[PDB]
Amino acid sequence: SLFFSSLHHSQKSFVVSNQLREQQGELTSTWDLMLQTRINLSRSAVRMMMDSSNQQSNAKVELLDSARKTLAQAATHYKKFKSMAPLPEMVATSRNIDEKYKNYYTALTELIDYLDYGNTGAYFAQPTQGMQNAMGEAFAQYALSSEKLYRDIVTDNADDYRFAQ
Amino acid sequence: LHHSQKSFVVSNQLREQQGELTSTWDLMLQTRINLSRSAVRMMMDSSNQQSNAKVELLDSARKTLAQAATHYKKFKSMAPLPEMVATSRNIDEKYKNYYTALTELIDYLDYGNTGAYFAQPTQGMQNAMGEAFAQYALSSEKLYRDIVTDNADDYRFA
Ligand SMILES: N[C@@H](CC(=O)O)C(=O)O
Numbered sequence: 001s002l003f004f005s006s007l008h009h010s011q012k013s014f015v016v017s018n019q020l021r022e023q024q025g026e027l028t029s030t031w032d033l034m035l036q037t038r039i040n041l042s043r044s045a046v047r048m049m050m051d052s053s054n055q056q057s058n059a060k061v062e063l064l065d066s067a068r069k070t071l072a073q074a075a076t077h078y079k080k081f082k083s084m085a086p087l088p089e090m091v092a093t094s095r096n097i098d099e100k101y102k103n104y105y106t107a108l109t110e111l112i113d114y115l116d117y118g119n120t121g122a123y124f125a126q127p128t129q130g131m132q133n134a135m136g137e138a139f140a141q142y143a144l145s146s147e148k149l150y151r152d153i154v155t156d157n158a159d160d161y162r163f164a165q
Numbered sequence: 166l167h168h169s170q171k172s173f174v175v176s177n178q179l180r181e182q183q184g185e186l187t188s189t190w191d192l193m194l195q196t197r198i199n200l201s202r203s204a205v206r207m208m209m210d211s212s213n214q215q216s217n218a219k220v221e222l223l224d225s226a227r228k229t230l231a232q233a234a235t236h237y238k239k240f241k242s243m244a245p246l247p248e249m250v251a252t253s254r255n256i257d258e259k260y261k262n263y264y265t266a267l268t269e270l271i272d273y274l275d276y277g278n279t280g281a282y283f284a285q286p287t288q289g290m291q292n293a294m295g296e297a298f299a300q301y302a303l304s305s306e307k308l309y310r311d312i313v314t315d316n317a318d319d320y321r322f323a
Pocket residue numbers: 043046197201270282283284285286287288
């Protein structure tokens with residue numbers, strides 16, 4: 001049977017705590033790629049404001065395509081996050097992330113649609129920054145909750161901890 | 166002696182170091198976003214409505230970049246574990262390059278040099294840091310797995 005290890009006397013504990021870390025990792029990747037999406041969008045939008053004769057304008061479409069690529073990758077990681085069952089103590093903060101993620105994700109997909117035809121006015125009018133900021137704060141909150149829970153688990157024994165259904 | 170306690174402290178350290186690098190990376194991307202938002206206002210120009218925010222936006226980039234550097238200093242305050250030294254030094258080299266790049270961009274916009282701003286190969290510098298971070302994360306995760314599963318000899322952490 002066990003010890004499995006000093007930190008995880010049963011190997012089930014390691015499965016749980018490792019889940020927890022994997023969920024953080026996939027949410028960190030989501031956030032990273034949403035911010036990369038914002039960067040590619042803004043680099044595209046600014047070039048759509050240029051004169052055609054500026055050679056720097058020529059990348060506007062490649063950059064919007066790169067936004068589409070990073071936003072797809074973000075959503076891939078987010079699905080991986082959601083595929084991993086939360087622990088009960090993480091359900092509330094996970095729902096909070098979900099709310100803010102949906103808002104900011106939707107926002108970014110709308111900006112892609114605006115730039116697709118060079119509609120820079122619709123792009124500027126969106127209050128994107130506030131949605132980004134809300135996601136970032138939700139992310140921070142999730143990370144603090146996760147870390148505190150992780151420390152509770154590894155210092156417990158225990159070796160119960162059961163995934164929420 | 167005290168193997169469990171040492172494993173708890175070292176695992177906590179590796180997590181905290183990854184968290185600080187994550188914060189540094191996110192804030193450097195936020196700096197790059199804020200720079201681009203300032204550039205959008207400069208391209209609207211005069212009193213074209215959101216255009217008067219160019220300075221506030223550029224100050225917001227300076228703020229995120231200083232916050233990045235704060236987290237990076239926190240990262241450096243945690244001594245690397247032996248098998249993490251080289252990947253830590255790789256992060257240092259790529260961080261410094263990208264940090265300098267972003268300071269150059271700030272300076273370009275502060276002096277109205279939009280051309281130099283757009284011509285800098287910023288993406289390559291970001292990507293090089295991102296690859297350094299990926300290498301670091303791989304190395305850290307191998308060590309972490311070994312520590313928390315009692316598969317690490319004492320030299321690696323104790
Ligand atoms: N070179 C800067 C500005 C730009 O090209 O839009 C960047 O890549 O962030």
